[PDB]
Amino acid sequence: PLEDQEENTLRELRLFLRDVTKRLATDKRFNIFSKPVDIEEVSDYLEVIKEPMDLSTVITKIDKHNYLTAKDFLKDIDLICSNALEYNPDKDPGDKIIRHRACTLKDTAHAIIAAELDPEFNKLCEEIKEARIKR
Amino acid sequence: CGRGKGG
């Protein structure tokens, strides 16, 4: 009944989220963020970063029905960016590019979300998230 | 800060 209409609305967001995540992942610049960080080159990511994230993990989380709101999905694109700034020093040019792309990834994601997605449509998602986190 | 990616 109601739970019906609900999942039709979620399925729709969940579809959009795949398309944003495909767009960010094709982008040349965001390539370093499309894999999980390796611990071969980086022998200390996990001692420095307590919550790793990447774009392919986001992909799967979409299919795992983890993102109830666009805001939830941005919570994880946001964690991509803060992870980079928290890990990489910004003196070396090499270090700096990554830093740049992380801010850019974040800004790109938000602008897309800000521009393609109907404000009325978020409100519906959030009203569904608060419902499912109850009864 | 971490050691860096490239070294």
CA distance A41 to chain B (A): 7
d(CA A110, CA A71): 9
Domain range annotation of chain A: 1-135
Closest CA to A45 of A61, A13, B5, B6: B5
Non-local CB neighbours of A17 within 8 Å, separated by 6+ positions: A62, A67, A70, A73
d(CA A110, CA A88): 22
**Would you call A92 and B1 a contact, using CB atoms and an 8 Å cutoff?**
no
d(CA A101, CA A87): 14
Note the resolution in Å, 1 decimal. 2.7
Closest CA to A128 of A56, A68, A40: A68
Nearest by CB: B2 against A88, A92, A94: A88
Please report, for residues A11, A50, A77, A117, the alpha-carbon distance to residue A90 in angstroms, rounded to integers and kept in the order given. 40, 20, 21, 34
CA angle A19, A63, A131 (to 5 degrees): 100
Contacts of A87 in chain B (CB under 8 A): 1-2
User: From which experimental method does this structure derive?
Assistant: X-ray
Block residue for tokens 């499309």:
A34
Alpha carbon A69 to its chain's center: 11
Non-local CB neighbours of A11 within 8 Å, separated by 6+ positions: none
CB atoms within 10 A of CB A135: 4
CB atoms within 10 A of CB A83: 21
- List the alpha helices (DSSP H) in chain A: 2-26, 45-48, 55-63, 70-87, 93-116, 119-132
